Design a protein around this ligand. Structure first.
Ligand code: SSX
Ligand code: SSX
Ligand code: GEH
Ligand code: GEH
Ligand code: MG
Ligand code: MG
Ligand code: MG
Ligand code: MG
Lengths: 236, 6, 236, 6
């Protein structure tokens, strides 16, 4: 590990600097090094890990979609044959994306999830596991596609079960988990009705619990509620 | 549209 | 060279795909591979090379500025000591930036410039040489700082001399060279008067030649003229 | 302001 010689606290400090500089690949590398120190992560450190990899993989996904669209058009009737290059380059980006997903899933399995006992940590990591299997599912085409989809589903479902027992309906992690699992249903599992039902029930149950919150917590929860509403508007 | 996730 | 086994035409095709996907590091790697085939570049290929590296180094420069600002504030009176990390990470980004500049300058010296005989190619490459020495000058602090600044000046000056003899005053390459050499004077050489004079004379001489142009050429030239005017507005 | 270059 190239970060093995750097202090944990220095890695966290540099992750924060990398975020300020919009250097998300560096941010992710620093946070990988911090995880590999073997200690549990704090709430803020979990956010830094998630932000770093979300930005890295988000850029890869956007690029993959551009290239996949070009590849699809290149294969339509009437298109001029232009050789293997579009497929090759889409595959290059895809392999890099899969590598990042494998890295994140590897950190979660070795050994973040097994040491995560509080709901705020365990739900967060299980949500991440669902997210990175979902990104693998977005590009998957082989014998293991159904198992990749089921791995995402299983991680999200365990997170949901814990979140419903241990967190209030307005907890932002619970809300973000539901938002993302709803997207999984809609985009990955071909289950738009489940996606819509989950988003609606999540929104309504959060609405009913807002009265318990401080002004700052209300702002946090309503922000994620608005994303649920945005998706519902897209889908209905 | 591409849906929101966090 | 990791691109040594890929066809020249495939590298160019993939550079264009990488641009569409906003994968500028890939774009630059593909164009480096294309240059290393040893053949001269066309006008469009020169643009692809320049766009790729301009975007890569532009991101590095923006990150370096963020980190350098944080470092400056960390060294003001009253600031809490926070260790070597800000300096280290600024240095990491700086070294990567210098590496990219060295790579581009290396392509120009081996052997793009020496084979460039037409003004449109030679001025373009000499402008690039000035630009990448200018980026090195932005971060330079050592014994060689004045020589780095002078290398930028010398490359820009050779480009200017050719451009004034061989290109019309509205040629977009001539205009962009003048724009950038003017910025060099203002930001690097501590010569704001020379910067302003160059931008003004360039603008006025282009204005007087617009009447010779087609509508499409007029659009191209006036776009760069507006940048000259924008800088003049900033500086006066 | 940071000046324009191309
Ligand atoms: C516990 O750590 C956090 C809590 C809350 C936030 C942001 C709030 C506005 C809620 N979204 C936040 C942003 C982080 C980062 N990008 N470094 S960490 C972190
Ligand atoms: C000769 O090649 C070019 C000419 C002109 C342009 C753009 C015009 C609008 C003038 N700025 C252009 C953009 C390129 C690219 N980003 N691949 S190549 C290229
Ligand atoms: S963890 C990063 C800080 N939080 C956020 O950026 C937003 C997206 C506003 O909130 C959430 C992020 C992640 C989850 Cl699981 C929930 C809310
Ligand atoms: S070479 C890329 C195509 N041209 C451009 O993007 C702009 C910036 C509009 O024009 C110029 C780029 C480079 C030069 Cl030297 C001059 C104009
Ligand atoms: Mg594949
Ligand atoms: Mg249910
Ligand atoms: Mg240095
Ligand atoms: Mg002069």
């Amino acid at each position: 590990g190239a970060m093995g010689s750097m202090e944990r606290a220095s890695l966290i400090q540099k992750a924060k600097l990398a975020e300020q500089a919009e250097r998300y690949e560096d941010m992710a590398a620093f946070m990988k090094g911090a995880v590999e120190k073997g200690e549990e992560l704090s709430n803020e450190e979990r956010c830094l890990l998630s932000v770093a990899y979300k930005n890295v993989v988000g850029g890869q996904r956007a690029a993959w979609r551009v290239l996949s669209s070009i590849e699809q058009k290149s294969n339509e009737e009437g298109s001029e044959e232009k050789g293997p290059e579009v497929r090759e380059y889409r595959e290059k980006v895809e392999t890099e994306l899969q590598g990042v997903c494998d890295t994140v899933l590897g950190l979660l399995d070795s050994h973040l999830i097994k040491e995560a006992g509080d709901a705020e940590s365990r739900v967060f990591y299980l949500k991440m596991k669902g997210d990175y299997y979902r990104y693998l599912a977005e590009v998957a085409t082989g014998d293991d596609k159904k198992r990749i989809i089921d791995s995402a589903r299983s991680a999200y479902q365990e997170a949901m079960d814990i979140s419903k027992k241990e967190m209030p309906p307005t907890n932002p992690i619970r809300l973000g988990l539901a938002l993302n699992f709803s997207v999984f249903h809609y985009e990955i599992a071909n289950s738009p009705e489940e996606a819509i039902s989950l988003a609606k029930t999540t929104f309504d149950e959060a609405m009913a619990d807002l009265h318990t919150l401080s002004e700052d917590s209300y702002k946090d929860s309503t922000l994620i509620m608005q994303l649920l509403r945005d998706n519902l508007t897209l889908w209905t | 549209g591409f849906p929101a996730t966090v």
